């Protein structure tokens, strides 16, 4: 009697039990050590798929560049980056013809976005490469460093607050003959200044930082991802904005819509294909990813698509949209941390930075790394490898799906000019293509035509992990369609458990996750009760907030027991204070504070909901009652939760490991910046709720506001003559401090 869970599929169809095929209960495979090997492998692989292209040497950066555009046509089914300019232009032209005015309307919408977009938009996003520090920094921090460097270099055209002005400053910076930056060296703190030549700054402005994608499920081997610099992101935002505007106007483009919007759009489109197909016509659906999609999406083709899309538009708009593909076509990839060398005989470790691989001897490496270094050495320049071809983890997902949907629209009977035709859905590298043809031979001919056309445009379908079946069931971006999308709960299992925001936000998020899974992922009511019980147990263990009546011993047990004895109405206690769990299927949508409000003791209610408690801290409105959640698959998600701000809405300790590094000064600067901003809010309460405006320094605004507030308070009598006198004298002293400096 050998039990075999897989045999369950003999009765339950695979899709209906697809959740069993997801091991997401276990830990995801993480990456150990450096990502330099993965970056080198990616660069070599990208240059291998385009080897038959043209080799040139950039005249500005001096690095070799490879152009596969209009290269020899593919002669084999392997991935190939030889995209044809004529074919891509033809695909875009036919997309325009089939969807008249799409490019024009999208261009105008992008025009208004470009007009009304501010520099602060670049603050969104995470782990942005900071060229000034040669490391990844938070997007806001990298933006601030770049702005400060530009100001110190005379690029004082960004104070207008418009992103386009910042882009103008970016170009002016690249055109400068020299640059000055500020770096800290400790040997004692030294605020040294470094001078960068034109070529070095150019190389470090096109540089693309690389790391290893961690916690990635479904892949045995780890892969390297990349994040761009501050200069690139500005133009990338506009490019993406235009591509997303175009995508929203395409029925086959489901990328911009997400979640249940994505599922509904895909369901409607597949239903339309099943409907408009002739009854007598044989219908098939292909499921597949595109092999080496990111490695083959050349940026020159993106430049061609942008130039075609921006036809007849104002020349400045064409420039703003086309700059990003230009820069990416001349991009560079940082290698990363480097490698680690060990000596067993002498029993010692060492880390060799990736910048010194262009000269280190090859005897220190194993065979695989030996050949990767040998192959990538020609492209190494100033610690970075030239990666002109391909798109290393490109952010042009929107543009790439525009190209895919253009090729997908090429399958209309007015374009195929044959009995067979095709349509489907495209999203980044994933696609689900439906072929209708009178007979199986027609289906095969249509499949071959689509595959060959994709090869022409540079899209390489992955024959390895793609398959065709009769229309009705398919898969698309981890969404399994079986005559209708089926719920796959295993995807949302990692979201369960303690989120780790705070006691209140984590209770609210847990109950909201259970409720959302009931609504969307077919979480039954009994299983919902199970999930609630398990989440409460995990929450109590994590937060050491077991019920006071329990004998469990923990460093927080004494206080909870004292509170339990103190309270008269036990039911009113929150779970974070040893109170019982009153949640159920009925009230998963009610915050615990409001759920237990009537049961709370008056004094306990006041203490818990005291607005003057020091635990609660409020940042800008954009970071209130919301959290960032990372699903098993997909990008970061902004989850909003309903929670009453109580003493439990505290902040966890901040990682202090930067205190014993040469770059502590940034932390100090952050502290001071906060010290200033919080005072500005003390003078302008609405600064947090909505961003303030003005050109004057903070000191001028604060002192003027203080003076006027003093006069109004005096007139209303809220302050006496002496208080007004002291306020005025302090303001005059502040003025004198500003003047003297």
């Amino acid at each position: 009697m050998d039990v075999n869970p897989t045999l369950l599929f003999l009765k339950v169809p695979v899709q209906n039990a697809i959740s069993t095929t997801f091991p997401y209960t276990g830990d995801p495979p993480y990456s150990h050590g450096t990502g330099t090997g993965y970056t080198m492998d990616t660069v070599n692989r990208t240059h291998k798929y385009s080897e038959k292209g043209k080799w040139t040497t950039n005249t500005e950066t001096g690095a070799p560049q490879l152009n596969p555009i209009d290269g020899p046509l593919p002669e084999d089914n392997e991935p190939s980056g030889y995209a044809q300019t004529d074919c891509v232009l033809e695909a875009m032209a036919f997309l325009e013809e089939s969807h008249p005015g799409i490019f024009e309307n999208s261009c105008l919408e992008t025009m208004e976005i470009v007009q009304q977009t501010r520099v602060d938009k670049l603050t969104q996003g995470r782990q942005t490469y900071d060229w000034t520090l040669n490391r990844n920094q938070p997007a806001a921090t990298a933006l601030a460093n770049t702005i400060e460097v530009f100001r110190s270099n005379g690029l004082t055209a960004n104070e207008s607050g418009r992103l386009i002005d910042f882009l103008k400053d970016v170009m002016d910076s690249m055109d400068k003959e020299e640059m000055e930056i500020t770096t800290h060296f400790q040997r004692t703190i030294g605020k040294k200044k470094q001078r960068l030549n034109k070529r070095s700054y150019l190389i470090r402005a096109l540089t693309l930082n690389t790391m290893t994608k961690d916690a990635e499920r479904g892949k045995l081997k780890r892969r390297a991802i990349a994040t761009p610099g501050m200069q690139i992101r500005g133009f990338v935002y506009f490019v993406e904005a235009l591509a997303r505007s175009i995508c929203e106007k395409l029925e086959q483009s489901g990328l911009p819509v997400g979640g249940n919007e994505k599922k509904a759009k895909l369901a409607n489109v597949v239903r339309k294909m099943m409907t408009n197909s002739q009854d007598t016509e044989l219908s098939f659906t292909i499921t597949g990813d595109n092999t080496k999609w990111n490695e083959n999406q050349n940026p020159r083709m993106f430049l061609a698509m942008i130039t075609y899309i921006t036809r007849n538009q104002p020349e400045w708009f064409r420039n703003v949209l086309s700059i990003a593909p230009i820069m990416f076509s001349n991009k560079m990839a940082r290698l990363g941390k480097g490698y680690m060398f060990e000596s067993k005989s002498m029993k010692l470790r060492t880390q060799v930075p990736a910048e010194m691989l262009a000269n280190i001897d090859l005897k220190y490496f194993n065979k695989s790394t030996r050949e990767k270094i040998e192959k990538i050495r020609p492209l190494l320049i100033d610690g970075t490898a030239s990666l002109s071809p391909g798109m290393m983890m490109g952010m042009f997902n929107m543009l790439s799906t525009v190209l895919g949907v253009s090729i997908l629209n090429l399958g209309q009977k007015k374009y195929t000019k044959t009995t067979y035709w095709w349509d489907g859905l495209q999203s980044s590298d994933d696609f689900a293509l439906i072929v209708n043809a009178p007979n199986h031979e027609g289906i095969q001919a249509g499949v071959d035509r689509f595959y060959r056309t994709c090869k022409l445009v540079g899209i390489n379908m992955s024959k390895k992990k793609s398959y065709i079946n009769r229309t009705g069931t398919f898969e698309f971006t981890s969404f399994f369609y079986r005559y209708g999308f089926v719920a796959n709960f295993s995807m949302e299992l990692p979201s369960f458990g303690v989120s780790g925001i705070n006691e209140s936000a984590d209770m609210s998020v847990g109950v909201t996750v259970i409720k959302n899974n009931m609504i969307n992922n077919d979480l039954g009511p009994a299983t919902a009760q199970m999930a609630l019980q398990l989440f409460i147990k995990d929450y109590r263990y994590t937060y050491r907030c077991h019920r006071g009546d329990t004998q469990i011993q923990t460093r927080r047990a004494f206080e909870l027991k004292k509170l339990w004895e103190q309270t008269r109405s036990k039911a009113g206690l929150l779970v974070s204070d040893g109170g019982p769990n009153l949640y159920n299927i009925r009230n998963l949508h009610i915050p615990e504070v409001c759920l237990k409000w009537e049961l709370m003791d008056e004094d306990y209610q006041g203490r818990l909901c005291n607005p003057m408690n020091p635990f609660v801290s409020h940042k800008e409105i954009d970071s209130v009652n919301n959290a960032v959640v990372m699903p098993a698959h997909g990008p970061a998600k902004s989850m909003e939760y309903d929670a009453v701000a109580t003493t439990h809405s505290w902040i966890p300790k901040r990682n202090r490991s930067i205190l014993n590094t040469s770059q502590r000064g940034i932390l100090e600067d952050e502290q001071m910046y906060q010290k200033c901003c919080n005072l500005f809010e003390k003078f302008f309460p609405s600064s947090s709720y909505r961003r303030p405006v003005g050109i004057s320094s903070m000191v001028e605004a604060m002192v003027s506001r203080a003076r006027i507030d003093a006069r109004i308070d005096f007139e209303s009598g809220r302050i006496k003559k002496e208080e007004f006198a002291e306020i005025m004298k302090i303001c005059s002293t502040i003025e004198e401090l500003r003047r003297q400096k």
């Binding site: 969307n520 609660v616 209130v624 609405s686």
Partner: protein, 126 residues
Amino acid sequence: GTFGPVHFRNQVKIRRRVDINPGHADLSAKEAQDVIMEVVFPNEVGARILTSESQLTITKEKKKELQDCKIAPLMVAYMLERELVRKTRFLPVAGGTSSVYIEVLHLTQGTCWEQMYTPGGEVRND
């Protein structure tokens, strides 16, 4: 709310946009923002002036209610944005799409069952 019997039926849930926060229908998002600025940050309003009578009345009642409220103005502003500004969401539903029914959607509509539930309180005439 009133709970009726639970009926086990072949529920067919269709994904469609519903409202999770009905908002103050008479006041568009911009009017709600102006009212919030009036109530929470009267001095930082700027040049804006309330014209719609609904704005004046709600601003009045809220100011009277919020008298001597020590709660952080930012939290009050966020809660007012939630209360006033309409917010919609695409959700698989099977019964009424009103907010009073969407918030209890997990409780009411299931994969194989429907819980006949009538939320308490007044219901919008629209």
